[PDB]
Structures are given as C-alpha cells and as structure tokens.
C-alpha cells in the first residue's frame, strides 16, 4: 500500500501551499502496531492550509495528526502562515517487540 507521502501527491493534496520540509521518520514499533511518522512544514494562507488538513483527514486510511503548530511567517498584513504537523500511518505488529 502506497505511503502517506504518495497519497498526498497522487491525489493532488496541498494546492496553493509551499512545502518547506518533508521528513519521513523511522518506524516506531509498539506492541499492537508499527507507526510510520512523517513531519511536514508547509506555508500558505489559512484557507489553503485548512483545505490540506481536510484533504489528509478524508483519505481512506487511518492517519493521526500531532504537534500542530501555526505561526505567521512575517509580521506583515495578512501574510502567509507556516504550519508544522506530524502525521502518522499504522500497520499491524504480529511479531512482538523482540
């Protein structure tokens, strides 16, 4: 199954947004599942950022979102925002924690 990075790009997510950083982190084993985290920083207006969050939220797969941060990039009038978020997908763990 294609990863979250591909889902964003295959379905065309993030219109109007300027990606700054995409970092795929090492998988984290837990006793019931393996987490696949992706850290993303992206710049845009509130509307385009919201559309992106809704797009990820509407994917037909379990994605959890964490560590949401948003700050204006500059003190100017109505300027764009920098949004940081950690997204995770999951797969089963049938092998324990050895």
Author numbering: 109 to 206
Q: What wording appears in the published article?
A:
Type IV pili (T4P) are long, thin (5–8 nm diameter) hair-like appendages which extend from the bacterial surface and promote attachment, cell-cell aggregation, biofilm formation, and twitching motility. The T4aP system in P. aeruginosa is composed of four subcomplexes that together form a transenvelope machinery. PilMNOP are critical for function of the T4aP system. PilN and PilO also form heterodimers. They are predicted to have similar topologies, with short cytoplasmic N-termini preceding single transmembrane segments (TMS), followed by periplasmic segments consisting of a coiled-coiled domain linked to a core domain containing two ferredoxin-like αββ motifs.
Although the soluble, stable complex was used for the crystallization experiments, the resulting crystals contained only a truncated form of PilO (PilOΔ109). Although the PilO construct used encompassed residues 52–208, we could model only residues 110–206. PilOΔ109 has two αββ motifs composed of α1-β1β2-β3 and α2-β4β5-β6. The four β-strands form an antiparallel β-sheet onto which the two α-helices pack. Previously, only one discontinuous β-strand was identified in the first αββ motif, but the new structure exhibits another β-strand break in the second αββ motif at the same position, resulting in a secondary structure pattern of α1-β1β2-β3 and α2-β4β5-β6. The main chain carbonyls of D175 and F176 do not participate in hydrogen bonding between the β4β5- and β6-strands in the PilOΔ109 structure, creating the discontinuous β-strand. In the new structure, a dimethyl-Lys residue (K196) was identified on the back face of the β6-strand, the result of the reductive methylation used to promote crystallization of the PilNΔ44/PilOΔ51/PilPΔ18 complex. The monomer orientation in the PilOΔ109 dimer places the β-sheets on the same side, forming a longer 8-stranded anti-parallel β-sheet. Instead, it is more likely that the previously observed PilOΔ68 dimer interface – in which both N- and C-termini are oriented in the same direction, towards the inner membrane – is the biologically relevant one, similar to the orientation described in a recent cryoelectron tomographic model of the T4aP system of M. xanthus. Only PilO R169D and I170A reduced twitching motility (approx. 40% and 50% relative to wild-type, respectively) and levels of surface piliation.
